[PDB]
Amino acid sequence: MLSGLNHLTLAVSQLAPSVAFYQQLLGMTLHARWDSGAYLSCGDLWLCLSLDPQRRVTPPEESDYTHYAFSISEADFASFAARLEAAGVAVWKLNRSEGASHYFLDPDGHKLELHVGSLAQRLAACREQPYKGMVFF
Amino acid sequence: MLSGLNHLTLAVSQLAPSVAFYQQLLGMTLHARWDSGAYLSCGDLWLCLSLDPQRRVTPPEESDYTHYAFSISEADFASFAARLEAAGVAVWKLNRSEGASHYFLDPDGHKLELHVGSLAQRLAACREQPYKGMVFF
């Protein structure tokens, strides 16, 4: 029986600028770095950055909607999004609205998101404005 | 301050086979579905499947090392891997490190992993036998 996410591994093209992005800009905790990777944490999340020469920097218009969202509180959301914009972090666009979210790209074009709210809150919101064809179990 | 992973969204080419894989084969809980997506949970992980015409069924040789690992106990590991093998699920890598890992593909070629063990256990192993260039913080 599966119990949750054990770790998320992102392939990166250059290790140093990616470590700087996740640690210095996003504030994640750096535990270890070596010649081909780094281990960080964000609360319960174990994030691994893995140096991969096959990673290409892809424009958001030509990558799919696969994305990774991080939790932030209502009180910090707007000021954090503002800090990312002031630092020149690029944005991307999703096809639909899923609540209070800010969409931004990492240096390799991984699609990231800041989101306020839990799954339970999302389901309650969707009961009032559902997506087309929505069924609840 | 970010507090953890809020949700993981995977782009899928066909909703029905992906729901079948995550819900029925992997045992995640289906909370809702709509014409272009579904919400599931696996422990404290909120997983979104998003139907995306841009998603290609991607062979493992054509994608980078980005991958998603799910937690499982050592006691359950071998029988879960055997279930995947009976269902015909492809493997994209052999485990060559210490620690139990099984590396398998979803129907669209997303790279998945079953892993036993935490970040703390990995850091302890690396302190005894560090990777090339490894520094701890």
Ligand SMILES: CCNC(=O)CSc1nnc(C(C)C)o1
């Ligand atoms: C499967 C259940 N887990 C999730 O809902 C992940 S996001 C999440 N979980 N708690 C929160 C707080 C912001 C209330 O946010």
Ligand SMILES: [Mn+2]
């Ligand atoms: Mn999202």
Ligand SMILES: [Mn+2]
């Ligand atoms: Mn892994």
